[model samples]
Target: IDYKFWYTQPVPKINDEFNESVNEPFISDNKVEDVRKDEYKLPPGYSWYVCDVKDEKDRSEIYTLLTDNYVEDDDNIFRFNYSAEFLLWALTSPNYLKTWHIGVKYDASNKLIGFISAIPTDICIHKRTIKMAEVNFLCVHKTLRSKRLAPVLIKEITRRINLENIWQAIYTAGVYLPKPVSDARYYHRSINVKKLIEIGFSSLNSRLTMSRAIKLYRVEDTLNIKNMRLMKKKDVEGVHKLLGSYLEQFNLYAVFTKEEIAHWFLPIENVIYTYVNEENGKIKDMISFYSLPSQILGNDKYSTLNAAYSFYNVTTTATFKQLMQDAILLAKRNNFDVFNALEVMQNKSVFEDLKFGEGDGSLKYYLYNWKCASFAPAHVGIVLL
Candidate 1:
């Protein structure tokens, strides 16, 4: 692939020697006063606006833009249908500023045609903590062949983040770009096996029929983890401590305050689900997943694949196998078609035995203005969702 956009930036070149340079910023040298003094100029009839997620009118505008133009499948048979509520929850994460929710509008009709967002995060890389911005959900209108603007969108957000003294940024891509700090493959557990086969998401084996495949992927009706229940406002501190301790073994993980714990882990219907195991009033372990359904394009019988993505989990007092098994059971009962997790953070050890199949999908972790020594998949613990 040609390096049109990446070449314009200061990240390590695709063919550069990986071990020759120490981890340092590529372009964080700008002081706050040296940052851009004016908004980046868009082409004529296009303008930039700071999206206000708190406003319903503005939120719906962003919802419509992303829903129609965001990430989709290779075959274009599915598109992510990000609900307005989900957008609000995702874009307004702790420390996220509204100004970073930048948008492009058609000046004639005032239609929002483009969007990009960033969330402030503190990521622990090996032994260092970098004040970083996590960039996500960049979108451009589907009709116009203006995707070239994506580079401009990224630049604008980069400028805004830099003004805040955040020189480094982290991004995850389904495809490899110029570089990657860690690579991890996606794994999937089939819940509604019959539906998946019918919708072209999966297929029967050479020697097996649909019914046999259905039986093979079946799960239990209820979870078996005792004292495991939904996390509450009261459990934030315990869960935070448990997660902080658990994440220490990995080379990469997000650091969060107890307030962030409550915001991200508290159960929200159709958005996020978190459960914790408490033994004698002590929260020992926790598991969580978030809802991200995709629209099944041109399918009459099924319009959506209700996917539950594994977020963060800590297994203690309960086996990783048992805890994840309960998660599968819980998602099955809650009407998820599949449960997807990455082969990171010791997850590969339990995947095959738990009936999860390797998904062709994968993610590459990348950082701007910073380069760390490469790591194996097991070192990646930050789930981008």
Candidate 2:
């Protein structure tokens, strides 16, 4: 049955008394320690530290750490990590992480052990007021996998959020964990035959197919390069036209107007790399990468560029390949280590070509209050960040 809810109902404000009680003693017990430098302790043999990667040396170290584990390839560039300039823009941008960039570190005898981060965001979900926190880039060093450090880092963030009076936080991970604090599941779709087979999706052994005849586009050598230029203010209309067509078959998609696109793609504060393929001076395709750079606490020696998210690539197969290749080239030139193609479009082939692993598993997207979004879960899509 189709179900719907009214959007006008007033949301009850979180009572001040209740909020105060929740944060009282806990805040006092665990004082917030600054991990900006590379000196902090974890446990007896382990230590904790945080960093913001404000210099070039720090950025180089971060690039090494990420590239060592995740490498770039023809199909996947692992181009998610940000450069120093990109980090500055992302952290300062009004829409992105303007408030803070945080990461945890665990080390023993000067070796990096574990890490995670939290960024501030203001999310408007279904007219309900919410000051949201997004927890991302949570990773533990290979040797420390057996240790239960993920939860420790998560708890640490949660404690901080309570102190800040932030009511909720939104995040996604591949593996399924406990979801009592906050939880919801979104949908996903994919083309499992041509694209999936090329990218090796059959390895999973899942049974699903489209009943109708499938349309296939063979890889063509002749390239049709259109408006291939840095994203700018005047290109909003073209970008909208491209995205609008891309989402036509989907039930849900983020409704971004020309003005929003300008704010999102043109700002210098963001390390935004947008490209377009224009035919006869009219835009035919577009793609962009949004990212941030981070550091491992305590380890003044290492850092990572976190490719937090991606925007839709509006173009034909040829244009898509060209734009993606350009993005990779740009990232490498900027000294980025890995390009995170956060949940990319379900065509798996697109990511497989870039050599991006299946990741730990799947990230779930939930809608607590809003019904309409720019992209729907059921459509073949992946939230880049």
- CA RMSD per model (angstroms): 1.5, 12.1
lDDT of 1: 0.86
| Candidates' C-alpha lDDT | 0.86, 0.45
Positional deviation of residue 344's Cα in model 2 after best superposition, in angstroms = 8.7
- Global lDDT for candidate 2? 0.45
- My TM-score estimates for the predictions, one after another, are 0.96, 0.48
Worst 10 residues of 2 by lDDT: 2-11
Model 2 bad stretches (over 4 Å): 1-41, 68-100, 104-108, 127-129, 179-228, 233-272, 276-286, 289-310, 313-361, 366-376, 379-382
lDDT of 2 by residue, 266-340 (tens): 735346767666666567777676655443322233433333234566666464555555555544444444455
Prediction 2 TM-score vs. true: 0.48
The candidate that achieves the highest TM-score relative to the unseen native structure:
1
